[PDB]
Design a protein around this ligand. Sequence first.
Ligand SMILES: O=C(CS)NCCCCCn1ccc2cc(Cl)c(Cl)cc21
Ligand SMILES: [K+]
Ligand SMILES: [K+]
Ligand SMILES: [Zn+2]
Length: 355
Amino acid sequence: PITGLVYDQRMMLHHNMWDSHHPELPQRISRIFSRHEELRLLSRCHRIPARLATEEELALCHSSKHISIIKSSEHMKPRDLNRLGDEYNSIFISNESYTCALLAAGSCFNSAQAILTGQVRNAVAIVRPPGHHAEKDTACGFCFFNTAALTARYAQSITRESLRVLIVDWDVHHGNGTQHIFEEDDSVLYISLHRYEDGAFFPNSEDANYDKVGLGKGRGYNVNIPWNGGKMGDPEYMAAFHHLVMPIAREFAPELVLVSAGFDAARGDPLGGFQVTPEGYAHLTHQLMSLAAGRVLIILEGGYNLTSISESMSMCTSMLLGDSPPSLDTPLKTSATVSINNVLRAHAPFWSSLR
Ligand SMILES: O=C(CS)NCCCCCn1ccc2cc(Cl)c(Cl)cc21
Ligand SMILES: [K+]
Ligand SMILES: [K+]
Ligand SMILES: [Zn+2]
């Protein structure tokens, strides 16, 4: 098998005991996994086992106070669980939440290790809860620990400190935690496509605008592609990949590609409102596979239409296995062109491939 796959149904145990209809449902990952079975993709993949992340591994990105607070939720009573949840922005916690977050990160460490030691060429991680909103010191937006950020640091910890890692976050929401963790770092390049609406979309901050290019040594290594006033889809995302993501990524020359692969920009998602098709996600995956000698890890983030995420993530695994990209069936929305051109102007000083 060229492609690894990690999935543990124990990550379904994280659940919302008060609002059982909260969109971050346990069956998100079991519907995706079941779709891999019936498409005969699972039999083509090398099964990578899940594991728990260690506390020392969580410390690669997170503060000891944040780690201790989330760990304490393990045996907390329902009232304590409730009052802890409302301390954060959009967070629900159960007694199983901390272990599920450990499994999500540990699954991705095992997959990155399999990729970097040559056991597989690439991998897919069907994990929950998501991670890209998690900050060094706090939980946010259904995320407890930043699985993608932790995986990049773990990858560097087993190869060399300066391993060039590219994180592409095509979740419809901005990965605020991922940006802040690496903002001063030039060894991890963070590129995010996200619905922005001039700061009126979760997580509702101007940190996600195109003018935040990074800090210090990290200047030029944070690329925000913000969408405004329009329901973006395959044309807008393909155009952003052609004019921004791939030119910068090729010049960065990553040795590992991590995809914060949320599918809430998919057509049919109740939260995102965009219309990226499953074939569009296939083409995005296909392009990133040309980087880092094919060493690509696809980590599930958001995405809340069960049918959309099952077809979309299975398309990506199909591409990872080497299947040919399916054909794509609109001229670009003007505000999307305006966005792409605003990002070009912001990052032209830092990337010769943009000028
Ligand atoms: O998806 C992700 C992680 S990738 N981050 C978005 C966070 C959403 C928080 C606020 N927010 C927006 C729509 C919405 C709908 C429901 Cl039902 C609830 Cl409970 C909260 C909501
Ligand atoms: K994003
Ligand atoms: K960075
Ligand atoms: Zn999202």
